[PDB]
Design a protein around this ligand. Structure first.
Ligand SMILES: COc1cccc(NC(=O)N2CCC[C@H](C(N)=O)C2)n1
Ligand SMILES: [Zn+2]
Length: 139
């Protein structure tokens, strides 16, 4: 689990969105596994606006933050799960790192701010849904 709290927005994995998120919906995209809802309180996270390919992510299944090198956001095939059929997910970045299903939502960050959140994984890989192109999160 986990979210990004920037301005009056809450960014979560679409597959983990709550009823309150759907009832206060700002934007959602199944192909990216992202959903953004509105918040009453202002958040403290800042979004990175950069082309970093190295950063650090939080892994809840280890209670640890790990440094990683990650691929550029791309269209990657994701196998069928209990949340989606087998499909291509867009704006996804892959890295070598530990992950379990419940790790979704952990933040990936670089020196400039939040880059994205954990969205896929398995067998010593971890995938992050990028948010750096969502310029509207800053206003
Ligand atoms: C997060 O790490 C792991 C580790 C092992 C397995 C998994 N499951 C995983 O990738 N998916 C299940 C949740 C929805 C994901 C998606 N974005 O389509 C696919 N995740
Ligand atoms: Zn950066």
């Amino acid at each position: 689990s986990g979210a990004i709290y920037v301005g009056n927005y809450r960014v979560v994995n679409r597959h983990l969105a709550t009823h309150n998120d759907w009832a206060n919906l700002v934007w959602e995209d199944s192909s990216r596994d992202l959903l953004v809802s509105s918040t009453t309180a202002q958040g403290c996270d800042t979004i990175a606006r950069c082309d970093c390919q190295t950063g650090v992510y939080y892994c809840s299944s280890r209670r640890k933050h790990y440094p990683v090198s990650f691929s550029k956001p791309s269209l990657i095939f994701v196998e069928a799960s209990e949340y989606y059929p087998a499909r291509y997910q867009s704006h996804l970045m892959l890295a070598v790192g530990h992950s379990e299903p419940g790790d979704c939502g952990g933040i990936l960050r670089c020196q400039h701010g939040v880059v994205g959140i954990v969205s896929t994984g398995g067998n010593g890989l971890v995938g992050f849904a990028d948010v750096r192109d969502l310029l509207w999160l800053d206003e």
